[PDB]
Short mmCIF file of C-alpha atoms and ligand atoms in Angstrom, two decimals:
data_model
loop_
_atom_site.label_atom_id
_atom_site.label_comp_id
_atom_site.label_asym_id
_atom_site.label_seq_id
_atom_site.Cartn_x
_atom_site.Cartn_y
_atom_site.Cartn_z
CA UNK A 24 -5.84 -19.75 27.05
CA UNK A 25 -4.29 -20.48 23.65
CA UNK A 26 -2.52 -23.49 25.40
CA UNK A 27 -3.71 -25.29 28.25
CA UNK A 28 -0.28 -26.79 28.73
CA UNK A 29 3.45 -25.39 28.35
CA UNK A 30 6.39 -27.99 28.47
CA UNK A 31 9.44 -25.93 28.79
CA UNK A 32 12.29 -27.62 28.61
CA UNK A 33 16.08 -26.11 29.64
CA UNK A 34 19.39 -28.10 28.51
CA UNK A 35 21.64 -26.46 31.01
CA UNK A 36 24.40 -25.17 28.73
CA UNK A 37 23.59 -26.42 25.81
CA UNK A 38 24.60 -23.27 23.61
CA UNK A 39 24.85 -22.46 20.15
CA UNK A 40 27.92 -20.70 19.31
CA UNK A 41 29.32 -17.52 20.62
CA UNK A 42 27.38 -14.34 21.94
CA UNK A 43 27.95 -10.85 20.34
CA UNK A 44 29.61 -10.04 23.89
CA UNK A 45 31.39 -13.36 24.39
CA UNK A 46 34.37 -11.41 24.42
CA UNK A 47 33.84 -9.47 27.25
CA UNK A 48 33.06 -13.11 28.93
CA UNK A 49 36.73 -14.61 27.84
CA UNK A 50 34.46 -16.21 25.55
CA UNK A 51 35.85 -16.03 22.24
CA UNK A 52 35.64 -18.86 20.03
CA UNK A 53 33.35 -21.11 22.14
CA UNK A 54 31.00 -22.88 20.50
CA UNK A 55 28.62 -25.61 22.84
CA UNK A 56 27.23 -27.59 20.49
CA UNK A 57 29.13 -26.77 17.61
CA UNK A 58 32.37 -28.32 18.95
CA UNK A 59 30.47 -31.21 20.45
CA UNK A 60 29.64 -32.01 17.16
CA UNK A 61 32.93 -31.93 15.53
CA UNK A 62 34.27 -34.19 18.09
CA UNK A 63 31.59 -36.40 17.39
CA UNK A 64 32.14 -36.52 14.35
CA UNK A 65 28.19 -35.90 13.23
CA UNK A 66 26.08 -35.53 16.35
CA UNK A 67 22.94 -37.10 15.91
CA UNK A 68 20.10 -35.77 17.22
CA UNK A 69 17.44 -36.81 14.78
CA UNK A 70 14.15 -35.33 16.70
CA UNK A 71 15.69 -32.29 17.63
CA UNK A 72 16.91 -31.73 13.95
CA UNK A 73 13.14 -32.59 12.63
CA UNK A 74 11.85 -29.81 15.15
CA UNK A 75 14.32 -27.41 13.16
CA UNK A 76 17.46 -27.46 15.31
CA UNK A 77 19.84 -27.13 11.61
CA UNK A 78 17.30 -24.47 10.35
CA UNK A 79 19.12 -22.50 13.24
CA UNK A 80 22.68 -23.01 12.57
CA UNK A 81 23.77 -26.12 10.59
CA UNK A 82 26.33 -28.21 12.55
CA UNK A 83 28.05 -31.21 11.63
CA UNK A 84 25.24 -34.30 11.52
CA UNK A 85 22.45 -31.11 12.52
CA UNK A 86 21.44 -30.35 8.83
CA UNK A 87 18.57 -28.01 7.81
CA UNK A 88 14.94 -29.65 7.41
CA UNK A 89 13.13 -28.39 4.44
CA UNK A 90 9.92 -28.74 6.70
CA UNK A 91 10.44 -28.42 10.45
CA UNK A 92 7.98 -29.71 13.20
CA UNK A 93 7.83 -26.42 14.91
CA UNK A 94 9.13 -22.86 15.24
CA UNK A 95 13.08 -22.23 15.46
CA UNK A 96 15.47 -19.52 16.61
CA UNK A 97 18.11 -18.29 18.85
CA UNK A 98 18.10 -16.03 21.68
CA UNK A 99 20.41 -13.56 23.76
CA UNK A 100 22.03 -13.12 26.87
CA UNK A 101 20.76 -9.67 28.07
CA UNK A 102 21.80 -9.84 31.72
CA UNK A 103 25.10 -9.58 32.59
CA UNK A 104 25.91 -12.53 34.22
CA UNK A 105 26.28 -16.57 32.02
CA UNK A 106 25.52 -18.01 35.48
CA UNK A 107 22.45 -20.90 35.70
CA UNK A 108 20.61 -18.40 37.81
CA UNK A 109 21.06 -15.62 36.26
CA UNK A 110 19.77 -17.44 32.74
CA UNK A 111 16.37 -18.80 34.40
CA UNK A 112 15.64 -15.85 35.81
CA UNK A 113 15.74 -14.06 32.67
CA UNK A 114 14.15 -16.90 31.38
CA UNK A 115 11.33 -16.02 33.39
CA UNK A 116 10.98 -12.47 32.87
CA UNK A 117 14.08 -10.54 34.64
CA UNK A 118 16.64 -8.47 33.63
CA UNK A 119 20.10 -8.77 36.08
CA UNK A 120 22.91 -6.25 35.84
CA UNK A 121 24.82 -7.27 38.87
CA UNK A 122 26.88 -10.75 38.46
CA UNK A 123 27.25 -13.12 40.92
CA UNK A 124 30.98 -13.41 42.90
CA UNK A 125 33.18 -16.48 43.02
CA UNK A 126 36.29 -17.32 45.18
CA UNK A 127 39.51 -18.99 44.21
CA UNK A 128 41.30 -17.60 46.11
CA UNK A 129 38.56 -17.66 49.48
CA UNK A 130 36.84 -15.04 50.73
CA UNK A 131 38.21 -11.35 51.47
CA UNK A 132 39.83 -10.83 54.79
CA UNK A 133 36.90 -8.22 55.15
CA UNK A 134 34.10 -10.29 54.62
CA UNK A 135 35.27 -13.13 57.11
CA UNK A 136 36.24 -10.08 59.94
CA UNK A 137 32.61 -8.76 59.88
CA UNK A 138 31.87 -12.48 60.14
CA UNK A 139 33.52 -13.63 62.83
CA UNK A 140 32.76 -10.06 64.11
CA UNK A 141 28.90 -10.77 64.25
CA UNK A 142 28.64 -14.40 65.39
CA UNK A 143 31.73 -14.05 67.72
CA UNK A 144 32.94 -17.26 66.31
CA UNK A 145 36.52 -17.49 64.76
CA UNK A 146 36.83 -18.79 61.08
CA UNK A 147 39.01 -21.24 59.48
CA UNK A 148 39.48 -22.77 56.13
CA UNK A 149 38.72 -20.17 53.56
CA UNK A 150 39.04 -21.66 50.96
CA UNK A 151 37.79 -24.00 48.03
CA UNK A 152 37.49 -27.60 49.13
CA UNK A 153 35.20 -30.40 48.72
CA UNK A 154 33.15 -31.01 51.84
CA UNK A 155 35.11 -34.41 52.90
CA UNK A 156 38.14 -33.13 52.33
CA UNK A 157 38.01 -30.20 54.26
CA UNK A 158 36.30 -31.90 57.28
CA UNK A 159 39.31 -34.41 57.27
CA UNK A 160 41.61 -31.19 56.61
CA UNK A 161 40.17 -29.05 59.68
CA UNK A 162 37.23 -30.74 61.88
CA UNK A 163 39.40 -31.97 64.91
CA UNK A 164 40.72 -27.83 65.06
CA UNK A 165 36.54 -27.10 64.78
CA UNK A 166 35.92 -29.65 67.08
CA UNK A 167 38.65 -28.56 69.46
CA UNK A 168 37.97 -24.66 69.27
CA UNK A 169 35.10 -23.95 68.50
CA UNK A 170 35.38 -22.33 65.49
CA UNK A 171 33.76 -22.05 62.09
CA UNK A 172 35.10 -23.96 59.23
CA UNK A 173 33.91 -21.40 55.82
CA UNK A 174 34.76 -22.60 52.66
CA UNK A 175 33.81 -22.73 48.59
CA UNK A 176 33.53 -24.57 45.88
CA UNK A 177 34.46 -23.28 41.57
CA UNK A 178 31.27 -22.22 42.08
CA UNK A 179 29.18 -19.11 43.67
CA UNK A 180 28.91 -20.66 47.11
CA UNK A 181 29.64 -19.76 51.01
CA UNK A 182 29.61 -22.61 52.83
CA UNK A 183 30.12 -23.14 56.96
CA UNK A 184 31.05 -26.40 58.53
CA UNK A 185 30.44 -27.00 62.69
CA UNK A 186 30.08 -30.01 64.62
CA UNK A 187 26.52 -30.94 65.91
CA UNK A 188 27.96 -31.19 69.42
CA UNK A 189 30.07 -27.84 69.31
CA UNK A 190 28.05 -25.24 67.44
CA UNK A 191 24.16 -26.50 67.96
CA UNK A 192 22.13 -26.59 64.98
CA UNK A 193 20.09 -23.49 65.91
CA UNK A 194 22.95 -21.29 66.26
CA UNK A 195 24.56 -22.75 62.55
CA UNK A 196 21.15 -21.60 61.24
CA UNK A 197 21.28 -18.53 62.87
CA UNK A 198 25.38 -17.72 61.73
CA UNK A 199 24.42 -18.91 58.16
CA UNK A 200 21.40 -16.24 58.21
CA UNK A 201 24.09 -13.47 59.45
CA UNK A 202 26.25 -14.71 56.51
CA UNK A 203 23.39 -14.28 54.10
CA UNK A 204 22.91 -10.91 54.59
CA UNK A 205 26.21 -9.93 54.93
CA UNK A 206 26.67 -11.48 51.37
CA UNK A 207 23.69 -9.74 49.79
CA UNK A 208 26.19 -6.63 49.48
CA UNK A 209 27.38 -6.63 45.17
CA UNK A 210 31.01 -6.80 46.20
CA UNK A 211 30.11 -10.06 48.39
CA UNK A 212 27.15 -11.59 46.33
CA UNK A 213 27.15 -14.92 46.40
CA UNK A 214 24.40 -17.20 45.09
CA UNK A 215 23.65 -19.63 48.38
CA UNK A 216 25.09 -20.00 51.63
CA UNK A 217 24.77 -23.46 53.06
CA UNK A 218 25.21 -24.73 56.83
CA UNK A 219 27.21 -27.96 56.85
CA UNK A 220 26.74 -29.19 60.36
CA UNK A 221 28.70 -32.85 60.75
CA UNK A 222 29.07 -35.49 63.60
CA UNK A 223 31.76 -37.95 63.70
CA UNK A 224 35.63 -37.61 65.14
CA UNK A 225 38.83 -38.16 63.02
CA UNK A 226 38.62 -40.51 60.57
CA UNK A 227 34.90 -40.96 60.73
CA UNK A 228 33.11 -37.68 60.01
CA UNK A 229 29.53 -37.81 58.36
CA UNK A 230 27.76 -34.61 56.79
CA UNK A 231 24.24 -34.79 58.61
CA UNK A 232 21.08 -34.24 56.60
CA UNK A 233 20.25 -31.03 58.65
CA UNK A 234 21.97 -29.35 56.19
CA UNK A 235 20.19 -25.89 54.88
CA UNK A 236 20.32 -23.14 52.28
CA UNK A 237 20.06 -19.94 52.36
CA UNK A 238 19.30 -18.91 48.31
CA UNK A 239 19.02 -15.06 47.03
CA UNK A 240 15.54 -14.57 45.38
CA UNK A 241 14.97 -14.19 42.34
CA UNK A 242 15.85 -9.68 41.40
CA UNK A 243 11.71 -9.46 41.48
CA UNK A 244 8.34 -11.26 40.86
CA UNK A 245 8.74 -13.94 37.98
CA UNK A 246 6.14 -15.40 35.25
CA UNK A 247 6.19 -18.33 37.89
CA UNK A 248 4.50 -16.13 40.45
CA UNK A 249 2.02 -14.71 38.03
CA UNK A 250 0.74 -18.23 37.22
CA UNK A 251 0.75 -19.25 40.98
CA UNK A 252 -0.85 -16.24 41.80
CA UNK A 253 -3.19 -16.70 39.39
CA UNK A 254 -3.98 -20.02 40.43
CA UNK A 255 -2.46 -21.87 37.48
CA UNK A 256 0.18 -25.05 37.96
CA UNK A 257 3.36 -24.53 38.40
CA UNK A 258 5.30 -28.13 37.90
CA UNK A 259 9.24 -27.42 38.32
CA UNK A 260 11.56 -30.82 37.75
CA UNK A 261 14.37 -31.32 38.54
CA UNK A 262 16.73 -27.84 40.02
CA UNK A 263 14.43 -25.68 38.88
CA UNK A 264 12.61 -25.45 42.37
CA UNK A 265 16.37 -24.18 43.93
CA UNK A 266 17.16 -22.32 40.86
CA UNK A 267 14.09 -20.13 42.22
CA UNK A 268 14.07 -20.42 45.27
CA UNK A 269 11.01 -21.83 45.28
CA UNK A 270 9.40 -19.03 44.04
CA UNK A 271 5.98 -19.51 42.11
CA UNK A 272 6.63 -23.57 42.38
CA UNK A 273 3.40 -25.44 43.25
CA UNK A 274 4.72 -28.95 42.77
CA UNK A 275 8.33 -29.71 42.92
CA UNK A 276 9.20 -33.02 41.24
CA UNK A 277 13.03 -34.49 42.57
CA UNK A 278 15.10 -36.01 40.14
CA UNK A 279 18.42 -37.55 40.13
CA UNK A 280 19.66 -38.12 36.14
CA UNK A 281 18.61 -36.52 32.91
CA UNK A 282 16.51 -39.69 32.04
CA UNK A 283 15.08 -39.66 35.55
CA UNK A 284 14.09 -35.90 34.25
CA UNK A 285 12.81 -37.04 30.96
CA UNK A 286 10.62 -39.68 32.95
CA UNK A 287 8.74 -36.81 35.37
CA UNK A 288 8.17 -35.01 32.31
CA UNK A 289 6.55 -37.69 30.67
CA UNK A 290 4.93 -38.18 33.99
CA UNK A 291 3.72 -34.49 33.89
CA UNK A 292 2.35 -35.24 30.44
CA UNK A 293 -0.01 -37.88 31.97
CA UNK A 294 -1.12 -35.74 34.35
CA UNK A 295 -4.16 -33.01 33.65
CA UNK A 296 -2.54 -29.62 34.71
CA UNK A 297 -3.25 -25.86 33.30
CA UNK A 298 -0.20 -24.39 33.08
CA UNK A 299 3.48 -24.63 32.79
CA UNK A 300 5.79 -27.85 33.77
CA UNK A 301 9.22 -26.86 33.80
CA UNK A 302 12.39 -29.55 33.36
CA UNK A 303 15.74 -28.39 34.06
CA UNK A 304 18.29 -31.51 32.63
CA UNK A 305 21.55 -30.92 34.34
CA UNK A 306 23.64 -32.96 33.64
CA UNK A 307 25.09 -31.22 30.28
CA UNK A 308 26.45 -28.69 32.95
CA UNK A 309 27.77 -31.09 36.08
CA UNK A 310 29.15 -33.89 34.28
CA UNK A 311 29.78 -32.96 30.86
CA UNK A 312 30.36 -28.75 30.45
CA UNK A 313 32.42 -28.58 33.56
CA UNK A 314 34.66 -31.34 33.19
CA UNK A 315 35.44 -30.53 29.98
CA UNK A 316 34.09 -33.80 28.35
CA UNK A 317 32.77 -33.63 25.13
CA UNK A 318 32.34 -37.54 24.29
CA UNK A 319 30.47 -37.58 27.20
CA UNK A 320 28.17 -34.34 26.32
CA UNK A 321 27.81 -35.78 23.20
CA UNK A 322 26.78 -39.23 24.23
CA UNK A 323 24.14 -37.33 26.41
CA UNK A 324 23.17 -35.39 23.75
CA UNK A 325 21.96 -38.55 21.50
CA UNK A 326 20.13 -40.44 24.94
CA UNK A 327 18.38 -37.28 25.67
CA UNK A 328 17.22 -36.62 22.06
CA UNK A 329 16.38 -40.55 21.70
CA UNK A 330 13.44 -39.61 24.65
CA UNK A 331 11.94 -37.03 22.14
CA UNK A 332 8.99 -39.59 20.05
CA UNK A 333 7.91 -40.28 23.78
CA UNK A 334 7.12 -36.26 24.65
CA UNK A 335 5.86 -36.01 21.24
CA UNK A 336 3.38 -38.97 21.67
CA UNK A 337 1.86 -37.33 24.05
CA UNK A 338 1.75 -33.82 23.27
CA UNK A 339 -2.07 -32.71 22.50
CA UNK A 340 -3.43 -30.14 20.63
CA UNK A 341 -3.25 -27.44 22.75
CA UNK A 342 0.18 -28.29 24.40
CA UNK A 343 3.16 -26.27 23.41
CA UNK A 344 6.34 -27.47 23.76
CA UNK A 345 9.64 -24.84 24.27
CA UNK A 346 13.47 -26.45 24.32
CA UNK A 347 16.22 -23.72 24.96
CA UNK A 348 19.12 -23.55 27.24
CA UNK A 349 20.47 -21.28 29.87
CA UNK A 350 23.98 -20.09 28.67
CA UNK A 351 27.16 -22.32 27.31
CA UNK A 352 29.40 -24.50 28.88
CA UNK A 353 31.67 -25.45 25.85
CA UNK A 354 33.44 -28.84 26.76
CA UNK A 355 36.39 -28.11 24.44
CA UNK A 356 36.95 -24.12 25.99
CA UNK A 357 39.65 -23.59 28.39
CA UNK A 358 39.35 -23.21 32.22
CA UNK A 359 36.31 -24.95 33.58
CA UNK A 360 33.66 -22.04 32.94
CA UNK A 361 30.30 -21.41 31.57
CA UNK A 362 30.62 -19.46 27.88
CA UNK A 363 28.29 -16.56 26.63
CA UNK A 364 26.57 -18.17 23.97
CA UNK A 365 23.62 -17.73 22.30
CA UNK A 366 20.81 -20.49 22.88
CA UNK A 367 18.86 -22.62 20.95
CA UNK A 368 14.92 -22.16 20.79
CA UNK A 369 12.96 -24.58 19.55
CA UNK A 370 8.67 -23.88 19.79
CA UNK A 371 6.60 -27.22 18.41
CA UNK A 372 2.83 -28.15 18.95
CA UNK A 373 0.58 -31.05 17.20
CA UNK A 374 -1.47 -28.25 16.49
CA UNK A 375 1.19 -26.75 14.31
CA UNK A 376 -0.16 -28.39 11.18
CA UNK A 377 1.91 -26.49 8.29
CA UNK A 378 5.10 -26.99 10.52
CA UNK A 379 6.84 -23.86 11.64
CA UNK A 380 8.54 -21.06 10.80
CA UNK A 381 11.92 -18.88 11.42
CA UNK A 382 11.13 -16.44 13.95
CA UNK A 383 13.46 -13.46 14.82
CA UNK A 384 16.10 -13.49 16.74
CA UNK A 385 15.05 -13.47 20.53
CA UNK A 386 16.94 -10.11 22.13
CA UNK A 387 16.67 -11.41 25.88
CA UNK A 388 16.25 -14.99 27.01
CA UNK A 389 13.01 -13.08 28.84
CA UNK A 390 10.77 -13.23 25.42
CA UNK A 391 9.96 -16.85 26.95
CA UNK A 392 8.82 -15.39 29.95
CA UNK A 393 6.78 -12.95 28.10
CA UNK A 394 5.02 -15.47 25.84
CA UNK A 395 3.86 -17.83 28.30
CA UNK A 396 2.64 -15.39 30.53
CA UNK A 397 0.45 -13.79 27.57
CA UNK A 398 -0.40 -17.25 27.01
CA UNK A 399 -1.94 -17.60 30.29
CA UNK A 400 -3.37 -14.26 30.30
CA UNK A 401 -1.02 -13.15 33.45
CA UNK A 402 0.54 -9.84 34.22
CA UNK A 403 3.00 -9.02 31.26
CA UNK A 404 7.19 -9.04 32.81
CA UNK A 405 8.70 -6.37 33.08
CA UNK A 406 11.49 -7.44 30.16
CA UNK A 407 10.64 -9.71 27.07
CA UNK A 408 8.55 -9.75 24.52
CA UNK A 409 6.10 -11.94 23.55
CA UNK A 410 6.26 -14.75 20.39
CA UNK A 411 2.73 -16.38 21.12
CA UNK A 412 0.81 -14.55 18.46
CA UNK A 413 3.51 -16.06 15.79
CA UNK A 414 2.69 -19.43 16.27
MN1 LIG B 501 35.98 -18.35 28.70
MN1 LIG B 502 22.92 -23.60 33.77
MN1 LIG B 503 27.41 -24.72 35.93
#
């Protein structure tokens, strides 16, 4: 192995200006970090902008470096979808032409008949709600009826709500199962369905922790498996263990903040793996993207970069460190949306004693995929190509 160790790092949604197909998207003029930085003012991220984050695309306070730490570039969006799933599966060596359905509106009248048709249960709801609101909204009809309550969120969700004491927990597993398959069909496809059993009465319901999920898998074998399979470490932080369904995960590290995730991954630095950790930071998506915030983004932007000279303390040798992103979320764009966006790609290792280099243009988000598997001396993916032998 060239490496022993890969740190890859994902800023969920932190983009770098408009894709080639943004339009397509409703996507025109966004611009992640780019607008994040005008607000701003001058962002300052003064690690990322030594590893060559301005040689990419200068930004106001993000300025070229005549000599950057490490490799730079941007990548594209191949698959069709600028969903987090769809993005770290490409990521990891897959290529998805099928996008994954939302409801505004609720479900179609279709769906819920073959439903309610299956599980003999009638449905209520339908529609986007937070969980407490729509137990307060409809429990005491669940309660009194036996019925289902189904409902969504903004994003690509099915979700069904019983009472512990009306529909037993074996038989909410079993319904959300029969929903999962129904909802495997492309007009349908929705990324999770979760059971939602509750206790409580009026005025006193409480969402019990027997909640499950019912993911899709990943659209075939990822890089992750290869390693697994190969008996390599697999050391997801953070989402990423949900993001895959678990898939090719050997150790799945919980975290509850971006600086909580910047702590495992220093954690993962202390530890002696072969193989790939992989930190998904979040919050630039939940807190910042989607509520349309970009003080906020920004402000994360700077606390995040300020845990850089830690990581880079402890890189070795014959550690390679990848930063890159899974799509935009521009918190200036209207709506509440992700945004097709080219992502940043940064590539840096001690080892790297001249500093690094432009590369070309990445043509699918999968070229990451591709290099650490040839890194590790794995099965090639099916989609991506390979950067290792550039470094
Ligand atoms: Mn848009
Ligand atoms: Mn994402
Ligand atoms: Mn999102």
């Amino acid at each position: 192995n060239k490496y022993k160790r890969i740190f890859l790092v994902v800023m969920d949604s932190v983009g770098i200006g408009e894709a080639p197909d943004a339009e397509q998207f409703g996507d025109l003029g966004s611009d992640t970090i780019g607008h994040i930085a005008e607000h701003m003012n001058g962002l300052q991220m003064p690690n990322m902008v030594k590893l060559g984050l301005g040689n990419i695309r200068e930004m106001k306070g993000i300025s070229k470096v005549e000599k950057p730490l490490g490799y730079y570039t941007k990548m594209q969006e191949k698959s069709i979808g600028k969903d987090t799933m769809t993005g770290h599966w490409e990521i990891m060596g897959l290529y998805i032409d099928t996008p994954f359905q939302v409801f505004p509106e609720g479900f179609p009248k279709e769906l819920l008949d073959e439903l309610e048709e299956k599980t003999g249960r009638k449905i209520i709801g339908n529609k986007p709600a937070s969980g407490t609101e729509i137990l307060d909204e409809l429990g005491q009809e669940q309660m009194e009826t036996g019925s289902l309550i189904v409902y969504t969120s903004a994003d690509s969700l099915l979700q069904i709500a019983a009472h512990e004491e009306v529909v037993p927990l074996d038989e909410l597993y079993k319904i959300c199962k029969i929903a999962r398959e129904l909802t495997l069909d492309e007009k349908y496809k929705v990324g999770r369905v979760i059971a939602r059993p509750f206790v409580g009465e009026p005025g006193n319901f409480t969402r019990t922790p027997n909640r499950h999920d019912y993911a899709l898998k990943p659209f075939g074998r990822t890089v992750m498996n290869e390693l697994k399979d190969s008996d390599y470490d697999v050391i997801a932080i953070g989402k990423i263990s949900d993001i895959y369904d678990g898939e090719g995960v050997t150790e799945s590290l919980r975290t509850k903040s971006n600086m909580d995730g910047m702590d495992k991954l220093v954690d993962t630095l202390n530890m002696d793996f072969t193989g790939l950790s992989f930190l998904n930071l979040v919050d630039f998506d939940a807190l910042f993207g989607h509520r349309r915030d970009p003080q906020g983004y920004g402000e994360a932007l700077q606390e995040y970069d300020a845990r850089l000279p830690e990581v880079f303390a402890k890189l070795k040798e014959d550690d390679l460190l990848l930063i890159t992103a899974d799509h935009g979320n521009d918190p200036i764009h209207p709506g509440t949306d992700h945004t097709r966006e080219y992502v940043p790609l940064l590539a840096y290792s001690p080892s790297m004693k001249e500093g690094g280099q432009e590369l070309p243009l990445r043509q699918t988000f999968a070229d990451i995929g591709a290099t650490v598997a040839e890194n590790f001396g794995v099965k090639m993916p099916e989609y991506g190509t390979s950067f290792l032998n550039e470094l």
